[PDB]
Write a protein that binds this ligand. Structure first.
Ligand code: ANP
Ligand code: ANP
Lengths: 926, 471, 157
């Protein structure tokens, strides 16, 4: 901050800053630093694609750099960069140590060549190369490096068990334990254990080596491998330790030439090929998967076929699964699992090849129906097949009522009963055109293409509903709340039937819903609320009448819509069985069985009597509430039809679980700050109030006046509004040059401890970036500066408003054509590298996740469209939105969609002309 | 035609049919045969991506196949498939011959390992590896294969000129001439000379090696390289013989440690990086282009930047041509050719990145106008830029008559006069909306946005026409 | 080459007098070009066409049917045509000019340009070489399309 910017003293505080970011472990902070004015040599500038997804050109650049084997620096970074994306066979076959003799005696200052090579020789091992090479490296007189002695002793344990002496094996394993316990271990307070992973990875592998080095027979052996499968359960899905541990297992059971060691060998070759497919670097998947291809594993053949199908090679993928499945109709080879799976993958390759359509896959599809009935992700995959087919049939014209969608609904609700994977994404796949054919029933009386089909498919929904789990229905419950109109009446009867199911089973989670149910002023809700109350009290579980207490809370919360002033009213309903409207009522656990699909019950005990209303010209009576544990959670009233915010909330609360399912997002610990919102009546709803409600408007008004930045306070809108488009940029530059870049001066006051400050800056960048581009993906607009929400606990950012969507700044007056909301005064506070950092990586991983399953996101945003809010945002406009979600550029192709679309959003938000060409109610520098 | 279709007798008349299509040389006829019911083993079915544009997965599949180095078939096809898409550094660094000793004495029935390795050792050479490895392979008692003796004698000529004895070099070159004239050559009537290319490629390289092995001084040397540039004119643009001949040239002038041999080295590293960019396998472009990057060639930096721009890497492409051009305003480094070219490529990368639009490239665009006026594919490239810009402006509405398309026509008809490359594709680029503004003149009388502009741009077409070539 | 470039132009109505074959060297060409831009579909006797391909060509192309240097020629042809198609767009601007046609419009020429770029039938994920080659091949080999057209275009001839 305080220096000449272009100056000689910068470069050393660039280079030690990047070596302390090697210490910090944030590889993308390192990336932003190497890309932000660190541009000395070209061989200094080619260390960025190293981590920018293109490591192959970096690696063969470094191996032609260091190939003369004399320079220290280039050759050390050659072996290290060659290490860091797992070309380990090429490390061990590299003849920088192999020659007419062994390696270099009296291992020089570039001993880290060895110290990076011995570990690759461990995790891909044999007898002879490990043997002669560590017996070359024993010929050192001294062994000063810790890591070479570490990997030496684990290698000598490996050759000891090649010689089959497990007590000497444990001797060297315990020696390695001594080395790490005495020489490697750093403390707490300093390390998110990403930096510890290089230690605990190797020690996990070492102990896993150790106790089944200390195994006796095959019963013990299969037991050891079963609890190694438990280790592979508890590892999560982090690729480098995954790869490391099971490749070390692979090295050991190819060391051991026992025959069940060979079976374990083949299956672990298979499984590391599986994770290499999962993490999409399928050359190592091939070079591992070969050793189980040649040992006659047809499932390994099928997933060799799937890596070929994944990359570019539709043709022989089709052809080899063709010859394998249509050859395999011999002895069982289990038909319901193996043959069902390979014919399933065959059928969806005929989908995504799209050349030999339905009837050819209809025959083997009914073969799938015959050979398997206990495994339903077949049915989900053919459900998305028929999603594609109904979209193709509707793509030419509005011709409906095919048997294909009827059968699609039928097996799909059958599939609901079995595993529950895509159900919580794809309940719209039944109900959307189920209610569309209900709309056809009200539309047209030719069109007796519905009636008997409607009765039969409603009977399918009935037999789904009497057998279904209760908890899966709540995932579309607001659209189930959005079902009011007649002309079917049996969809109404069955949605009241699922209200009865979800009311009798789990009554606690539906209290606010069954009371917001009948709350309107154009109340046709009297029937659909009072009659379900009659039927629930007709059902035998009614010990307590908290229904009327919830009605009293609702009439109080709508009485306080106008209690103005410019509270200590009625209470003692708390304590009750009223479970709190915090998301710690409604969050859903991942399925890890028996289990329970909800949080534990957080009821109410106390009621706050003091008012804490703002002066926001409508004055929301927001309350401070003490829960069942005793903690304080702010619960707000809200006005003016807060339903679309619940809709965006439901999109966000499927988005975050998709972020959890992403093993790249929450690998970097992604995720959004989020709250709870419900609609209760018209112009009356509920809100959660976040810990540390603050915004950039309020607290930057305080910060610029703490620096006493005196300005044209409420006359800048006059002297910019009377100003035309010519001086708009002029007065904008005048403003933003008067106002200094500050926000780090507020962050350092927020966080004394730079632990909290820097992890809050990471949380800040990520939690701002994700919500920020997802908003403009939704077409949000009008992001006034009261809408940034920032906790002072950890800096997590969220947009909360969502009260305007789908071009409400452009085709609305005061034309507000927006890139998206970004403040230029965020950029210094994000770091030295401006916005060019973990912001950008979060953007990359966010887009990579969102364009994996966007058709489920399309099913979610179908619920949005529903323009009681909007004038002419149409179904085709939703398809245009879907095109934008896919990657359809502004009438352009060549869609990179990750780095290109990230650069698109970044370098459209940094366009200062767009920053000037919008209204200073959205003053951008705040 | 006349058989049972599903029958046992088909498979042998599949496999000899595919070996006679190896004889026929039509690699895609081979491809159709291997993809049309030749589906025995998976290791028989993974020889199709070999020629179906994905050779890398095929190659590391074959090198993990043959890595145990005992089977004849898998290891021979390992080295051959590894050869057939030019991983020659990996061939020569492959330790199927390198060990604690040299290679296998009494070269067995898989001597085609050697016979495919010595040629890669030729076209990427040094002193010591060529030296000790062909002096390993001399220790055979008999040398029954023709091709191993061919590549042996061209390698011994290379070590003879490492020892700097050109008469003994020509002795072995003429020995290699004797080998091909006595043992390789087939006739006419039977060969579209694609099949002869494996012979005439090597002999072209061998003679090009030969007469400037028989060179005396630098005047003779630059003359030899100038008529080698004539050879590179008459080669056409067939990638494998291109690569082979100039990489052999590269091997020889890195053998010769003379300083103009090093200048010739650097520029031939540059040019094979150029053809590797042209044929789009830019890992070999990088691994060649390095040896002239480290010898301070900024045009090689710029086209390293263009292989990075080509692949996936807009960002540092922009950034390194940014730092190089906006650093290069020193002594001339010719402004009208080199600096004009690098700023031109900078400007169209700002086009195809599309983030820092017109005015930022308008300033350096007029800088291009200042520094160069004799070279017009700048003007064609900014003509297609304004094609994109007029399409973008018309993409929102039918608003015409901008000064940008007027100037576009103006320099574009100026560009017509100079080189005539995109003219015969893009005469519509002037006349289409020239006659559209004529249609605006008949359409609408607001729309006095045409008249004086129409007269001025018609005067531009007039001064194009009095100076233009007729044809 | 001529076969897929015709349907790229949207040719249609390839009656069997239009194949031209020299007995000197077997070079093929379509010559007619007297009908373009959906003159089989929105014209009576609806003639929705993949493009002209005769199934009796496939044995004569070789043992491998149509799956060969046909396919490689298709790959290299598409790889060339989607390098400089904006110059090809400048050429086909001259076509539009519908004194011949009723309502083939400028926006219809942009739709044609989208087809030339690789815009699928309302789909993305455009491989545009092996995928589009397989698209043309496995739409021409669809026997239902071979039956669903008029036998004045008798397809087996
Ligand atoms: N659900 C929420 N969670 C946390 N903070 C919120 C929430 N809703 C609003 N706020 C905060 O409340 C502050 C006061 O504004 P608020 O009364 O909530 O709306 P408002 O000021 O009336 N917007 P407007 O209707 O345009 O005047 C805002 O600056 C937000 O930071
Ligand atoms: N330009 C040409 N070059 C070579 N052969 C041609 C050419 N034009 C037509 N033919 C051939 O002439 C043959 C006789 O038909 P032709 O008289 O040319 O048109 P046509 O039979 O009248 N078509 P139509 O108008 O529908 O009856 C055709 O089968 C073509 O093979």
């Amino acid at each position: 901050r305080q220096n000449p910017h272009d100056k000689n003293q910068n470069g050393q505080l660039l280079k030690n800053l990047q070596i302390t970011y090697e210490e910090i472990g944030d590889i993308d902070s390192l990336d932003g630093v190497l890309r932000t004015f660190a541009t000395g040599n070209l061989v200094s500038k080619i260390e960025e694609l190293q981590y920018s997804e293109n490591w192959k050109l970096a690696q063969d650049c470094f191996n032609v750099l260091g190939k003369f084997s004399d320079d220290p620096k280039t050759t050390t970074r050659m072996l290290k960069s060659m290490y860091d994306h797992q070309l380990y066979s090429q490390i061990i076959s590299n003849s920088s140590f192999h020659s007419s003799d062994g390696k270099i005696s009296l291992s020089p200052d570039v001993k880290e060549w060895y110290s990076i090579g011995l570990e690759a020789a461990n995790l891909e091992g044999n007898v002879q190369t490990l043997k002669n090479w560590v017996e070359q490296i024993e010929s050192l007189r001294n062994i000063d490096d810790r890591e070479v002695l570490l990997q030496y002793n684990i290698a000598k344990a490996l050759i000891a068990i090649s010689n089959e002496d497990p007590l000497r094996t444990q001797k060297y394993i315990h020696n390695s334990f001594r080395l790490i316990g005495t020489n490697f271990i750093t403390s707490s307070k300093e390390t998110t254990l990403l930096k510890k992973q290089n230690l605990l990875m190797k020690l996990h592998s070492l102990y896993d080596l150790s106790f089944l080095s200390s195994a006796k027979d095959k019963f013990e052996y299969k037991s050891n491998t079963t609890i190694l499968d438990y280790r592979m359960e508890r590892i999560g899905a982090d690729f480098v330790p995954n790869h490391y541990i099971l490749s070390m297992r692979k090295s050991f059971d190819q060391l051991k030439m026992n025959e069940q060691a060979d079976a374990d060998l083949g299956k672990t070759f298979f499984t590391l090929a599986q994770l290499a497919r999962n993490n999409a670097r399928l050359d190592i998947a091939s070079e591992s998967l070969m050793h189980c291809l040649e040992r006659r594993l047809p499932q390994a053949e099928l997933e060799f076929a799937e890596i070929l199908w994944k990359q570019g090679e539709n043709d022989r993928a089709l052809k080899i699964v063709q010859e394998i499945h249509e050859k395999y109709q011999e002895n069982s080879s289990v038909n319901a699992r193996d043959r069902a799976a390979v014919l399933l993958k065959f059928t969806e390759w005929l989908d995504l090849s799209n050349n030999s359509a339905s009837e050819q896959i209809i025959k083997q599809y009914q073969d799938i129906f015959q050979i398997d009935s206990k495994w339903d992700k077949p049915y989900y995959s053919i459900g998305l097949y028929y999603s594609r087919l109904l979209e193709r049939k509707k793509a030419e014209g509005y011709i409906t009522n095919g048997r294909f969608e009827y059968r699609a609904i039928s097996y799909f609700l059958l599939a609901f009963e079995k595993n529950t994977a895509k159900v919580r994404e794809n309940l719209p796949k039944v109900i959307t055109f189920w209610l569309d054919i209900a709309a056809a029933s009200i539309s047209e009386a030719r069109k007796e293409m519905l009636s008997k089909a409607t009765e039969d498919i409603c009977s399918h929904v009935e037999e789904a509903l009497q057998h279904c789990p209760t908890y899966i229905w709540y995932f579309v419950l607001t659209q189930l709340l959005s079902r009011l109109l007649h002309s079917h009446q049996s969809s109404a009867q069955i949605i009241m039937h699922i209200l009865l199911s979800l009311a009798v089973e789990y009554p606690s989670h539906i209290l606010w819903y069954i009371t917001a149910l009948v709350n309107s002023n154009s109340s046709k809700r009297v029937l659909r609320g009072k009659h379900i109350l009659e039927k629930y009290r007709q059902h035998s579980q009614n010990p307590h009448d908290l229904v009327s207490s919830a009605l009293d809370l609702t009439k109080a919360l709508t009485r306080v819509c106008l209690q103005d002033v410019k509270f200590k009213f009625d209470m003692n309903v708390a304590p009750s069985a009223m479970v709190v409207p915090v998301r710690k009522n409604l969050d859903i656990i991942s399925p890890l069985e028996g289990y329970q699909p909800f949080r534990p019950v957080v009821s109410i005990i106390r009621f706050g009597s003091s008012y804490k209303v703002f002066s926001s010209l409508k004055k929301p009576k927001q309350l401070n509430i003490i829960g069942s544990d005793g903690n304080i959670y702010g619960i707000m009233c809200k006005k003016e039809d807060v339903r679309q915010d619940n809709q965006y909330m439901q999109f966000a609360t499927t988005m975050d679980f998709l972020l959890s399912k992403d093993i790249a997002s929450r690998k970097r610990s992604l995720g959004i700050n989020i709250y709870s919102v419900l609609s209760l009546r018209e112009d009356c709803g509920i809100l959660e109030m976040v810990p540390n409600v603050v915004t950039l408007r309020s607290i930057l008004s305080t910060k610029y006046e703490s620096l006493k930045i005196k300005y044209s306070l409420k006359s800048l809108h006059d002297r910019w509004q009377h100003t035309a488009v010519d001086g708009k940029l002029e007065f904008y530059m005048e403003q933003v040059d008067k106002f200094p870049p500050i926000l780090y001066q507020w962050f350092l006051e927020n966080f004394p401890d730079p632990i909290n400050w820097f992890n809050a800056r990471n949380t800040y960048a990520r939690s701002y970036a994700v919500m920020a581009m997802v908003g403009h993906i939704l077409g949000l607009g009008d992001r006034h500066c009261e809408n940034i929400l920032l906790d002072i606990q950890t800096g997590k950012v969220l947009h909360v408003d969502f009260d305007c969507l789908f071009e409400k700044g452009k085709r609305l007056p005061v034309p507000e054509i927006v890139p998206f909301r970004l403040t230029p005064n965020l950029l210094d506070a994000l770091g030295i590298i401006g916005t060019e950092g973990t912001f950008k990586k979060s953007s990359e991983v966010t887009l990579a996740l969102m364009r994996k399953n966007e058709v489920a996101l399309m099913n979610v945003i179908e619920t949005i469209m529903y323009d009681r809010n909007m004038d002419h945002s149409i179904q085709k406009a939703l398809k245009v939105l879907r095109n934008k979600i896919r990657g359809i550029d502004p009438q352009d192709g060549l869609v990179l969609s990750v780095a290109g679309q990230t650069e698109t959003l970044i370098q459209e938000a940094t366009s200062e002309d767009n920053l000037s060409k919008m209204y200073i109610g959205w003053l951008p520098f705040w």
